[PDB]
């Protein structure tokens, strides 16, 4: 219904967006290592539906 501002920080850079996010009740980042390196960290964005 209203515009929203999103700022996230993954392992590489920053993402700042201003859009119409349909945020869920509990936005979050699913976070998991890789099987061999474990040096960087892979993220799945569960912040907004659309």
């Amino acid at each position, epitope marked *: *219904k*209203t*515009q929203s501002l999103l700022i996230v920080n993954n392992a590489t850079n920053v993402v700042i967006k201003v859009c119409e996010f349909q945020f869920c009740n509990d936005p979050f980042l699913g976070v998991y290592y890789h099987k061999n390196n474990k040096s960087w960290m892979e993220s799945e964005f569960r912040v907004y539906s659309s």
Partner: nanobody
Amino acid sequence: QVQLQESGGGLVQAGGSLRLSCAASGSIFSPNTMGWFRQALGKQREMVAVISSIASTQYANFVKGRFTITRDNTKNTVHLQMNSLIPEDTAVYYCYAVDKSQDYWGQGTQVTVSS
């Protein structure tokens, strides 16, 4: 170019029912207010009804309890359900996209009622 699509008017005998529709596409920024406006040949733009994003409904005294507006959040569209027609309602209508900056306007729908 925000465009408002109007449909669903025409010729109906006294006592009939119709359903107008305005679909506003383009920018249509978030806190939008959608209205419906009346004009018969020789008169001015008569404010029929008004809806905000709050879902509140505002209607005039002219046609008390006979127009209804329906909201579609998924497509953000609007429908007029006009029931119990009377030949004083014979006037073309336009929809008013308030938006937040550049208020838009419709192309019109002819609504005609007589016997």
